[PDB]
């Protein structure tokens, strides 16, 4: 049969937003303006302020999504090819690190708001984008034999969840989906919130988690790594103090949360 | 921060008429007793001379370059109120006062902040959106003797700004030429992330 | 089931990307919201299929090859877009549960799926197709139940349920028995709430291949189409139409036990998604047309330019061309407060020798008027020319069909006396009335009449009276505004001019052809039609004192002075003067009639009546 | 593109729309009136061998070329939806020659991408009908009435090759 | 009458109500369109709304006003005087390839112009001077000179001591000449001079100088100096002797390089023309003299290299300062900025220079075409000036570049005018001033050794100055630590050409005077380097190298422009 046969910064951000979401993993490079610094930080701050306001009002995920999604196109665009939007998102997050690393209360509030925004944006993805984003983060499925041996217990665990979360009222549909569903084994301490609600099957200190659940692990890893980075960002705040022109902006940004 | 607060200490732009030599303050597309902005451009009210784009842009550039040269004249002032010495001499310590016995700190009389705010004030005068929104620094107060009697309507200001968009953009490009070379502007992330270089 | 959500998401991405469709949603919504506080536009949008091709090929081919699985989620996404946008608060009871989503339509580049009724084939079932043909039948409009609402007497709870039928949905579901529930699950007696329930309109039509494409005198073939909601009654029989929709099958096809031995086939239909007409008359002006029309009107002699631009291939007869132009403009129709009616439209007659371009000039009006019907005098009867009975149903004739238009009658002299007298009402009262067995009705016929005839002796005889030459009663000739006599007088230079003119005409070649291949300033006819349309719609000249001063004097002098005038002069002559003055003012785009218009109208009437200027 | 090539000689004679940028005396014969001048902003349809030069020679050249109808947007959409079904013979007899000439004249990038896809997609069905040898007429004949003059030569030279090989083999 | 009937003859007689008349009159007065134009646009407005009842009411007229503004904004969106060495050296014949039409590549007679500095270091952002960085530069200058002096005179580090501390023993001290009063009033005598020490040498303190025991001296502000003396009383440092600063070395080349440069010119002499701005008078923008000069350059002079110093467009030009720029009838489209003014006036004229003439452009700090408004200054952007890459090279200010073997040192700041000397003694005063200034430039090893820089004031308002960015003054030093063979520093003073310590120092003068009279330019003829004629001096070492001795083999002619 017949057969034939700075740029680096732009490539870096194209790589970082190929998945459409990021753990905000790497040091930015090059330059932006100070007006851009202030405005981008304030835009992300406004979105996170509304997220914290809705959570203090005890609104659900669907209501918060209805409230926040129109604001991305104005303040912080998502699901976009634009280099400007991608840099805006990345730099705004990194600025609010320096604003909110200063104290435990600020770190907790920033981690909570940013993790909830991470959850919202993850919900906006297609399943293919979610799979690719999870795989890019380098994030144990059980064998078919182990699934067969534990099939009764796993099905008893997930059958109600399949009906209520995936709307599979028919038992026939639930059985077919369960036949097609994969499960993850890990220590029970890692998914303890699902353990307290009895949403996972426990055996010998290991929790058995279906594939259609487990986003709390992703968001918890995001929150934990963000907290560790904020603790690190706190430790080298004395290097931030070499430029006086940034401190009034950060004080202004933090004043809205105090 | 409003333009009124930001540009409180800036020097007002003065334009000299090419025909009758009368100097007047320029405050963008606003009512004035000395000039009128028509559909054809800037016109002097004293002699009805219409300014060409070059005549306006050269005067703007001359004012910018005068401010830059004043900045690089390098006048220093001691911040101690008792000493208050003004000199262009720079010690090898820079901030040490040259008067014997004085512990005050020498600072530039015309700082880079003042120059940058001056250049932005020039840039603001030729921003079309600020002219439409009437957000510019006022060149007259209501109690001033030269306060114009007839005020331009908001619709008239928007129409004149649309009609003169090319001229305003040209003057703003002349200002932006120098603002892009001002060192006070940008923030380098590559050097800033030295902790990842730990 | 999960695939339904992703397709909704993908079409949401499409609607966000191409922003011109958001503006359509918002404009329809704000327009409807405005007038509601005092017509209403439908909840329908037309998308370009090319945009969907360039956005996502997989969705484009999915729409175009598997419509049953792709059209519903996209429509759902459009409804979500329109619902999220701001809307008027506190809706009424009926508005709260209307069950009325938005709906889609398509245009552009169907490719292989553009078909005709002859070639629609079993391979194309369940595809999205476009067909062309002529409408032949239309059913009566009927309502159709889709949802009902019920109030429980004891508990105070409102209940509801939905219904489906095979033609209501692209996807297939178990049919519903159309029964109203009388009793609650908990035994409470129910009541039906009409006005909160929802009904929709329904209509079936039939479309046939055009006769121009019929092979070998073979039987023609046709398809039935289903319409609903907004698409109802937008067509009538005889319309040439292009229809877009999904081609689908129905029924059990005899496999449910039948005597046929299953030789009979399944039934098939097209579910109407969009309908477009075909031009086979009207035009819509652009801004440049308005500018040109207003600028041209200020020339000193617009009337001469426009009149001479009518039928340039015919030499001479300036006054008849000017009269035809004034006919095409027309007067102003009056309706007084007490219900009395005063005529507005102008009628013209021309009689003359053989070969003098009567029929050729009459043919020109048929190809520049917006609505025109043509007939020959001897090929039409009185009932056929006005109206007839059938089964009781009453059927319209030619003068009734052209209501606000012009009717051309050639060979007027050959019409029998029994046929002519039917026309005396239509040319003044502009109505047709029938009183026959089992029927009494009145019909409207507002048209202008132009006709041609031959004199009695074969050529006009100046040595005998005009009545002797023109054998028609005085009561009929009175109804024609302008009567023209034309003759073929032999003269050297006249003959040379006409012969050179027609020889120059016959040497024309169209632009795109080599020689021998088979096939002042004059405005083009496509511009003149726009000029006439604009002038007829947008300007309504009112009369003035200065014109009246001329009209009264001319009328009283013309009636009383003894002359050999060729037509009876009656009270209708004054109306002719007023109509002609108004029409000439309308040519000028003047808001008022002036002295000049009356002067010109008088000079034209004097030429036609007394034969000399 | 040889000098003596008949098809190139004949393709250059197709007319394109044009607009003038100077008034010139005596050249009214282009407007079929030798006794009058040409005037600025007059629009005329001229053959390509003349418009190709009057658009270049000066400054402002004498003539500006208007976008012809055979490269209109409707044709491009029709090409991109279904190239195989398209009746290019009715659109223009010498489509793929004028396309290359226009691309050379204006250095279009996107038009080249469209035309390359069109040619490549139609070559497949052309080869299909070339390979099909009788041991049928209507099915072949319906498609072969929508070929350009350019495509007919390729079809003939393919069909004869296949036929000669078959005749030699089964002999 | 007129407006009312004009409305009523286009709009219907329903417009007779005076409010309607007033509204339509307001529209035509606001937008300048006639009544019939307003009627036409009203007819446009009546279209496309399904509103057959487009009645001439107040609300409809308000919507028509909104429509008119929408159409307006949418339409907007749519739319020989003196000579050095004349008796020994003949004027060069120039480049023989100049004037030849041939497109053929200029194969043999290629004078190589190569920059001898890092252009990237000059691309720093201006208008941000940290006082600490400036003070660091000023201190580093004193320390570098201290090291040079220690190595040259073979002094121990302990021989240097603080001159501000009382000492009975004689010490060596290196520092900067500074005024005794920080508020000095523009006139310095020998009795008002103080020595500023480095941070390490004397903790940056200043000590008054007692120069009574010195008979001959020539000092200026910002000069780095070295003294042997004592501070007996603690108030003034008594200078016993001035240590002359060592001159920098001269550039050298190998025998192979000199033979290559000899083969490149085929034994002919190099010809270089040097001009300095302004290129038009103070009362107009005529470049007729420049056009005539370029025609002479292309047809008669035929130089190998042309060096053009700015300012090309002097921002301090009187017409620019007063805003009285004339209309230019020769241009179809008038310029809108000074950059466009350069592109319309200078660029057509400069493009007529022959491609065989290598053109070097050096900016001025007063040039409107340069956004880098500080000394040291970045090069002009050649692409922005639309000049051809083949034969135009834009260099920094100051610029060190090499023409064949010859090292050129160029600085477009008026060091000769600005440097004001405090002199004492008959022998020093009898010597020519510009010689002493050139020696100060060579000894300090910087093209503009004055600090604080000069300023120009009018009755006081600041006009202009040297415009020094103090943090980057290291770029103003001689590159490589050696003097140039030829030093060019244009000055407002009278043109001259002189040999000062084996360096040919040239002031070409202004190209045109303020009155429009002809100024001057410099024509430099340098004979080819020949190893056999004895004009080159062999320096013995591991690899034998030769001093260029350009001053022995260079002729400089100052010629009326
Ligand atoms: N200027 C002209 N005057 C007269 N006849 C003309 C003229 N130009 C063309 N004709 C030709 O004259 C012929 C007769 O036209 P036609 O309209 O039939 O006359 P007519 O009045 O209808 N005769 P008839 O049918 O017996 O009443 C046609 O072939 C026309 O093309
Ligand atoms: Mg006839």
3-class SS at E486? strand
In a 13 Å sphere around the CA of B12, the CA atoms on its Cβ side amount to 15
Peptide bond just before E311 cis, omega within 30 deg: yes
From atom 5 of ligand 1, which residue's Cα is the shortest distance away?
A: C357
Cis ω for the linkage preceding A93 (within 30 of 0)? no
Taking residue C65's Cβ as centre, other Cβ atoms within 10 Å add up to: 13
Only one residue has tokens 């000769």, namely E416
Domain for residue E260, yes or no? Answer: yes
| C17 at interface of D, judged by CB pairs closer than 8 A | no
Q: Which residue has the tokens 């020998």?
A: E190
Q: How far apart are CA E92 and CA E511, in angstroms?
A: 22
Cα-based distances in Å from A48 to A74, A103, A114, B194, C400: 14, 17, 7, 28, 73
Residues C261/C157, Cβ–Cβ less than 8 Å: no
Whether residues E282 and E398 fall in one domain: yes
Q: What Å resolution does this PDB entry report?
A: 4.6
Give Cα C71 distance to the centre of its chain: 32
Q: How far is CA C441 from the centre of its chain?
A: 24
Per-residue tokens: E30 = 């606001």
Q: Which helix (H) or strand (E) holds C550?
A: helix C545-560
Say if residues E205 and E164 touch (Cβ distance below 8 Å). Answer: yes
Domain of residue E241 covers: 125-249+414-483
Q: Which among E115, E136, E207, E191 has a CA at the least distance from the CA of E403?
A: E115
SS3 of residue C291 by DSSP: helix
E399 and E255 assigned to the same domain: yes
CB B45 within 8 A of CB B51: no
Q: Helix A104-124 and helix A215-235: axis angle, to 10°? A: 140
The answer to whether position E106 is within a domain reads no
Q: Assign 3-state DSSP to chain E and report helix, strand, coil percentages, each to 5.
A: 30, 25, 45
Last residue of a domain, one of E436, E455, E483: E483
D15-20 β-sheet, strand order? D43-47, D15-20, D63-65
Q: H helices within E266-335, ranges in order? A: 288-296, 318-322
Residue B147 to residue B144: CA distance in whole angstroms: 5
Q: Which own/partner pairs from C432-440 qualify as long-range (CB within 8 Å, at least 24 positions apart)?
A: C432/C386, C432/C387, C432/C397, C432/C399, C432/C400, C434/C387, C434/C389, C434/C394, C436/C389, C437/C389, C437/C392, C438/C392, C439/C389, C439/C392, C439/C394
Q: Which residues contact C373 (CB under 8 A, 6 or more apart)?
A: C398, C401, C402, C405, C406, C407, C408
Of E439, E457, E483, the residue that ends a domain is E483
Spatial CA neighbour of D150 closest among D73, D105, D94: D94
- Edge to edge, the sheet with strand E252-254 lists E252-254, E545-547, E537-539
Q: Is the CB of C568 under 6 A from ligand 1?
A: no
Distance C315 CA to ligand 1 centre (A): 11
The DSSP letter of residue E297 is I
Are the beta carbons of E380 and E394 closer than 8 angstroms? yes
Q: Is the peptide bond before E398 cis (omega within 30 degrees of 0)?
A: yes
Tell me the technique behind this structure. cryo-EM
Tokens 């009902």 belong to: C148
Q: Are residues E289 and E393 in the same domain?
A: yes
The CA angle C187-C191-C194, to the nearest 5 degrees, is 150
- C285–E13: do the CB atoms touch at under 8 Å? no
**Alpha-carbon torsion angle D122, D124, D129, D135, nearest 10:** 180
Q: Is C127 annotated as belonging to a binding site? A: no
As given in the structure block, the two tokens for residue D52 are 């190709």
E255 shares its domain with E321: yes
Same domain, E528 and E428: no
E236 is a domain residue:
yes
| Residue E224 falls inside a structural domain | yes
Q: Is C459 in the pocket of ligand 1 (CB under 6 A)?
A: no
The finding on whether C95 has its CB within 6 A of some atom of ligand 1 is no
Domain boundary among E483, E510, E526: E483
Strand ranges for E269-398 from DSSP E: 270-276, 305-309, 358-362, 392-394
As for how many domains chain E has, the answer is 2
> Which member of E125, E131, E320 has the closest CB to residue B182?
E125
Domain assignment of residue E22, yes or no: no
Q: Are E446 and E412 in contact (CB under 8 A)?
A: no
Same domain, yes or no: E347 and E491 = yes
Residue C424 Cα distances to B79, C388, C428, angstroms: 111, 17, 7
Residue B69: half-sphere exposure toward Cβ, Cα within 13 Å: 22
Buried b (16+ CB within 10 A) or exposed e, E479-489: beebbbbbbbb
Packing angle, helices C595-610 and C545-560, rounded to 10: 20
* CA of C469 relative to ligand 1 center, distance in Å: 21
Task: Count the Cβ atoms, other than its own, within 10 Å of residue C3.
Answer: 9
Q: Residues E310, E198: one domain?
A: no
For C:338-377, CB contacts with D below 8 A are none
Whole-number Å distance between alpha carbons of E95 and A195: 91
User: Tokens for A25?
Assistant: 């993993």
Upstream peptide bond of E376 is cis (omega within 30 degrees of 0): yes
Of E380, E374, A117, E325, the residue nearest B65 (C-alpha): E374
How many angstroms separate the CA atoms of A162 and A160, rounded? 5
Across the C/E interface, how many CB contacts are shorter than 8 Å? Answer: 19
* Cβ pair C409, C363 in contact under 8 A: no
Is D78 an 8 Å CB contact of chain C? yes
User: Nearest Cα to C273, choosing from C301, C240, C247, C300?
Assistant: C247
Closest residue of B to E184, CA-based? B87
H or E stretch at D104 = helix D95-106
Angle between helices A171-180 and A151-165 in degrees, nearest 10: 120
Closest CA to E396 of E354, E365, E356, E442: E365
Contacts within 8 Å (CB) and 24+ apart, C516-521: C520/C305, C520/C308, C521/C305
Instruction: Please tell me the distance from the alpha carbon of residue B94 to that of residue B71, in angstroms, as a whole number.
Output: 16
- Report yes or no on E316 lying in a domain: yes
**C249 CB within 6 A, ligand 1:** no
Contact at 8 Å (CB) between E148 and E245?
yes
Answer yes or no: is the C-beta of C502 below 6 A from any ligand 1 atom: yes
Nearest to A53, CA basis, from A129, A113, A128: A113
Is C354 annotated as a binding-site member? yes
Q: Are residues E142 and E241 in the same domain?
A: yes
Nearest to C32 by CA among C86, C73, C75: C86
User: How far apart (Å, rounded) are the C-alpha atoms in residues C412 and C422?
Assistant: 14
Closest to C128 in 3D by CA, of C57, C48, C77, C61 = C61
Q: Phi/psi of residue B59, each to 5°?
A: -65, -40
What stretches of C89-139 adopt beta strand conformation (E)? 103-107, 128-138
- Closest ligand relative to C360 C-alpha: 1
Closest CA to C448 of C323, C327, C604: C327
Are E285 and E405 in a shared domain?
A: yes
Residue C358 is assigned to a ligand binding site: yes
Same domain, E443 and E519: no
Query: By the CB < 8 Å criterion, does C285 face chain E?
Result: yes
Q: Is the same domain home to E149 and E283?
A: no
| Residue E40, in any domain of the structure | no
- Assigned domain for E36 exists: no
Q: Is C499 in the pocket of ligand 1 (CB under 6 A)?
A: no
Residue E276: phi, psi to the nearest 5?
A: -135, 145
Alpha-carbon radius of gyration of chain B: 21
**Which of C308, C319, C322, C316 lies closest to C360 in space, CA to CA?**
C316
Using a CB–CB cutoff of 8 Å, tell me whether B135 touches chain E.
no
C269 and C167 Cβ atoms separated by less than 8 Å: yes
Q: Is B183's Cβ below 8 Å from some Cβ in A?
A: no
How far, in Å, is the centroid of ligand 1 from the Cα of C503? 14
- Give per-residue burial for B47-77: e unless 16+ CB within 10 Å, then b: eebebbbbbbbbbbbbbbbbbbbbbbbbebb
Residue of C485, C281, C237, C283 whose CA lies nearest to C373:
C281
Does one domain contain both E280 and E134? Answer: no
Neighbouring-strand partners of residue A202: A207
Q: Report how far residue E109's alpha carbon sits from residue E125's, in angstroms, rounded to the nearest whole number.
A: 39
């Amino acid at each position: 049969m017949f057969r034939q046969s700075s740029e680096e910064e732009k490539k870096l951000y194209a790589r970082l937003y190929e998945s459409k979401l990021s753990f905000y993993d790497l040091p930015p490079q090059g330059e932006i303006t100070l007006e851009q610094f202030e405005i981008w930080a304030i835009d992300r701050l406004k979105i996170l302020l509304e997220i914290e306001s809705c959570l203090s009002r005890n609104k659900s995920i669907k209501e918060i999504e209805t409230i926040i999604k129109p604001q991305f196109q104005k303040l912080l665009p998502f699901n976009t090819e634009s280099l400007e939007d991608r840099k805006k998102d990345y730099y705004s997050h990194f600025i609010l690190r320096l604003c909110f690393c200063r104290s435990k209360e600020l770190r907790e509030k920033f981690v909570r708001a940013e993790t909830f925004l991470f959850k919202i944006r993850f919900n906006m993805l297609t399943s293919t984008d979610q799979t690719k984003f999870v795989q890019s983060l380098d994030l144990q499925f059980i064998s078919n034999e182990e699934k067969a041996e534990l099939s009764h217990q796993l099905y008893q665990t997930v059958s109600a969840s399949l009906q209520f979360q995936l709307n599979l009222n028919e038992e026939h549909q639930r059985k077919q989906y369960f036949q097609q569903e994969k499960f993850i084994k890990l220590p029970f301490e890692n998914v303890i919130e699902l353990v307290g609600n009895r949403l996972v099957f426990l055996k010998d200190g290991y929790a058995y988690l279906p594939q259609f659940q487990q986003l709390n692990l992703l968001s918890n890893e995001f929150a934990s790594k963000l907290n560790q980075e904020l603790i690190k960002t706190y430790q080298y705040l004395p290097r931030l103090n070499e430029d006086d022109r940034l401190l009034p902006i950060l004080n202004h940004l933090s004043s809205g949360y105090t | 921060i409003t333009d009124v607060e930001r540009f409180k200490d800036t020097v007002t732009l003065e334009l000299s008429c090419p025909s009758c030599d009368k100097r007047f303050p320029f405050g963008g597309i606003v009512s004035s007793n000395y000039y009128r902005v028509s559909y054809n451009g800037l016109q002097c009210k004293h002699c009805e001379q219409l300014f060409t784009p070059l005549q306006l842009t050269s005067q703007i550039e001359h004012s910018i370059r005068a401010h830059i040269s004043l900045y690089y004249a390098g006048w220093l002032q001691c911040d101690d109120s008792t000493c208050g010495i003004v000199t262009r001499q720079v010690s090898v310590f820079g901030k040490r006062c040259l008067n014997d016995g004085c512990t005050g700190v020498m600072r530039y009389k015309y700082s880079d902040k003042q120059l940058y705010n001056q250049l932005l004030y020039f840039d603001s005068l030729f921003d079309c959106e600020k002219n439409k929104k009437q957000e510019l620094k006022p060149i007259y107060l209501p109690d001033d003797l030269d306060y114009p009697k007839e005020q331009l309507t908001e619709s008239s200001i928007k129409a004149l700004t649309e009609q003169n968009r090319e001229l305003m953009e040209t003057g703003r490009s002349v200002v932006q030429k120098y603002l892009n070379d001002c060192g006070r502007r940008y923030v380098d992330m590559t050097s800033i992330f030295d902790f990842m270089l730990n | 089931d999960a695939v339904f959500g992703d397709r909704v998401r993908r079409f949401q991405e499409f609607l966000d990307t191409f922003t011109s469709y958001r503006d359509s949603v918002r404009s329809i919504q704000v327009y409807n919201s405005n007038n509601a506080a005092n017509n209403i536009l439908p909840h329908r949008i037309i998308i370009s299929l090319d945009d969907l091709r360039e956005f996502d090929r997989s969705f484009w081919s999915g729409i175009l090859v598997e419509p049953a699985y792709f059209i519903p989620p996209a429509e759902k996404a459009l409804t979500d877009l329109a619902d999220s946008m701001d809307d008027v608060p506190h809706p009424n009871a009926s508005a709260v549960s209307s069950r009325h989503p938005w709906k889609l339509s398509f245009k552009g580049s169907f490719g292989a799926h553009a078909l005709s009724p002859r070639t629609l084939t079993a391979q194309h079932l369940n595809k999205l197709v476009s067909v062309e043909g002529i409408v032949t039948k239309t059913s009566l409009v009927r309502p159709k139940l889709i949802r009902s609402v019920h109030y429980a007497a004891k508990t105070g709870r409102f209940h509801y349920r939905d219904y489906t039928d095979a033609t209501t949905t692209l996807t297939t579901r178990i049919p519903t028995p159309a029964i109203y529930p009388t009793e609650d699950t908990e035994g409470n007696k129910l009541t039906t709430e009409y006005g909160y329930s929802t009904f929709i309109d329904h209509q079936r039509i039939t479309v046939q291949e055009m006769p121009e494409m019929a092979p070998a005198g073979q039987l023609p073939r046709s398809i039935d189409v289903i319409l609903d909601d907004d698409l109802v009654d937008k067509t009538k029989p005889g319309d040439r139409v292009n229809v877009v929709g999904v081609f689908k099958s129905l029924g059990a096809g005899g496999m449910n036990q039948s005597n046929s031995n299953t030789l009979i086939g399944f039934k098939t239909l097209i579910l109407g998604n969009t309908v477009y007409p075909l031009h086979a008359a009207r035009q819509m002006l652009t801004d440049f047309d308005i500018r040109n029309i207003n600028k041209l009107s200020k020339k000193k002699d617009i009337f001469d330019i426009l009149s001479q631009s009518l039928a340039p291939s015919i030499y001479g007869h300036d006054h008849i061309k000017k009269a035809i132009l004034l006919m095409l403009m027309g007067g102003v129709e009056k309706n007084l407060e007490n219900g009395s009616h005063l005529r507005g439209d102008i009628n013209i007659l021309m009689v003359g020798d053989p070969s003098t371009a009567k029929s050729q000039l009459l043919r020109f009006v048929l190809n520049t008027a917006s609505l025109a019907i043509a007939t020959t005098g001897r090929g039409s009867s009185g009932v056929g020319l006005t109206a007839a009975v059938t089964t009781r149903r009453l059927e319209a004739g030619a003068m009734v069909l052209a209501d606000r238009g012009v009717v051309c009658i050639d060979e007027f002299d050959k019409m029998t006396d029994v046929d002519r007298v039917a026309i005396h009402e239509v040319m003044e009262q502009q109505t047709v009335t029938i009183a026959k067995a089992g029927i009494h009705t009145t019909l409207n016929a507002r048209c202008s009449v132009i006709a041609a005839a031959n004199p009695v002796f074969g050529q006009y005889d100046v040595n005998r009276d005009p009545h002797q030459n023109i054998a028609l009663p005085d009561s009929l000739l009175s109804r024609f505004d302008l009567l023209f006599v034309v003759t073929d007088d032999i003269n050297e230079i006249r003959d040379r001019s006409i012969s050179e003119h027609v020889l120059r005409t016959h040497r024309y070649l169209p632009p795109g052809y080599l020689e021998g291949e088979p096939v002042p300033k004059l405005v083009t006819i496509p511009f003149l039609r726009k000029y006439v349309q604009y002038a007829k719609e947008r300007v309504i000249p009112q009369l003035t004192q200065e014109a009246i001063n001329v009209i009264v004097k001319n009328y009283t002098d013309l009636r009383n002075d003894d002359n050999t005038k060729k037509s009876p002069i009656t009270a209708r002559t004054l109306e002719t003067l007023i109509r002609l003055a108004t029409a000439h003012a309308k040519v000028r785009l003047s808001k008022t009639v002036n002295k000049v218009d009356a002067k010109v109208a008088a000079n034209l009437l004097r030429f036609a009546l007394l034969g000399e200027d | 593109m040889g000098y003596y090539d008949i098809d190139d000689v004949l393709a250059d004679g197709t007319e394109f729309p044009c607009k003038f940028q100077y008034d010139i005396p005596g050249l009214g014969y282009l407007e079929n009136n030798p006794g009058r001048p040409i005037t600025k902003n007059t629009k005329l349809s001229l053959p390509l061998w003349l418009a190709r030069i009057l658009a270049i020679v000066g400054p402002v050249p004498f003539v500006e070329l208007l976008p012809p109808d055979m490269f209109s947007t409707k044709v491009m959409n029709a090409i991109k939806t279904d190239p195989v079904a398209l009746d290019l013979h009715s659109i223009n007899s010498h489509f793929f020659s004028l396309a290359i000439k226009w691309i050379m004249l204006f250095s279009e990038k996107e038009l080249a991408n469209v035309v390359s896809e069109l040619l490549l997609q139609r070559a497949q069905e052309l080869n299909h009908h070339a390979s099909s040898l009788s041991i049928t007429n209507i099915a072949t004949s319906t498609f072969l009435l929508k070929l350009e003059e350019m495509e007919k030569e390729i079809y003939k030279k393919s069909h004869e090759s296949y036929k000669d090989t078959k005749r030699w083999m089964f002999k | 009458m007129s407006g009312s009937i004009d409305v009523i003859t286009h709009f219907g007689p329903d417009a007779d109500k005076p409010e309607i008349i007033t509204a339509l009159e307001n529209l035509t007065k606001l937008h300048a369109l006639s009544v019939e134009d307003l009627y036409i646009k009203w007819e446009q407005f009546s279209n496309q709304r399904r509103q057959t009842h487009t009645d001439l009411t107040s609300k409809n007229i308000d919507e028509f006003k909104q429509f008119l503004q929408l159409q307006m904004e949418k339409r907007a969106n749519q739319i020989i005087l003196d000579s050095l060495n004349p008796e020994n050296i003949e004027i060069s014949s120039g480049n023989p390839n100049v004037g030849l039409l041939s497109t053929e590549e200029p194969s043999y007679n290629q004078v190589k112009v190569e920059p001898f500095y890092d252009a990237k270091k000059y691309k720093f952002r201006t208008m941000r001077q940290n006082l600490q960085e400036a003070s660091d530069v000023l201190d580093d200058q004193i320390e570098s000179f201290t090291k040079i002096i220690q190595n040259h005179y073979k002094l121990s580090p302990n021989d240097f001591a603080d001159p501000t501390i009382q000492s009975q023993s004689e010490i060596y001290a290196v520092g900067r000449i500074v005024p005794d009063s920080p508020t000095y009033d523009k006139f310095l005598n020998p009795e008002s001079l103080s020595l500023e020490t480095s941070r390490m040498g004397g903790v940056g303190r200043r000590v008054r100088l007692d120069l009574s025991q010195v008979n001959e001296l020539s000092f200026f502000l910002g000069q780095i100096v070295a003294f042997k003396g004592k501070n007996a009383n603690g108030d003034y440092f008594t200078v016993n002797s001035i240590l002359p600063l060592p001159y920098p070395n001269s550039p050298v080349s190998t025998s192979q390089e000199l033979q290559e440069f000899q083969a490149n010119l085929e034994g002919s002499s190099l010809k270089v023309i040097v001009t300095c701005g302004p290129y038009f008078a103070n009362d107009n923008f005529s470049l007729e003299l420049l056009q005539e000069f370029i025609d002479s350059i292309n047809n008669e002079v035929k130089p190998h290299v042309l060096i053009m110093f700015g300012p090309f467009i002097d921002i301090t030009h009187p017409l620019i300062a007063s805003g009285k720029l004339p209309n230019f009838p020769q241009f179809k489209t008038q310029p809108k900025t000074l950059d466009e003014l350069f592109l319309k006036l200078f660029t057509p004229i400069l493009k007529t220079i022959s491609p065989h003439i290598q053109t070097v452009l050096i900016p001025s700090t007063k040039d409107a075409i340069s956004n880098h408004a500080a000394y040291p200054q970045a090069s002009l952007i050649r692409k922005a000036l639309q000049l051809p890459k083949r034969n135009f090279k834009c260099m920094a200010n100051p610029s060190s570049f090499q023409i064949n073997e010859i090292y050129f040192g160029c600085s477009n700041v008026d060091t000769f005018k600005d440097l004001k000397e405090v002199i004492k003694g008959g022998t020093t005063s009898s010597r020519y001033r510009l010689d002493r200034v050139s020696e100060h430039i060579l000894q300090q090893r910087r093209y503009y050794p004055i600090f604080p820089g000069s300023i120009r004031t009018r009755i006081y308002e600041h006009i202009s100055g040297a415009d020094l960015d103090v943090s980057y003054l290291g770029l103003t030093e001689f590159v490589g630590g050696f003097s140039p063979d030829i030093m060019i520093i244009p000055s407002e003073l009278q043109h001259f050409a002189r040999v000062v310590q084996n360096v040919v120092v040239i002031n070409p003068g202004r190209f045109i005077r303020a009155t429009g009279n002809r100024g001057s330019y410099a024509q430099i003829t340098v004979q080819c380097p020949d190893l056999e004629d004895g004009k080159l001096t062999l320096v013995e070492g591991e690899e034998p190298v030769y001093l260029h001795n350009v001053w022995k083999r260079a002729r400089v002619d100052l010629i009326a422009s």
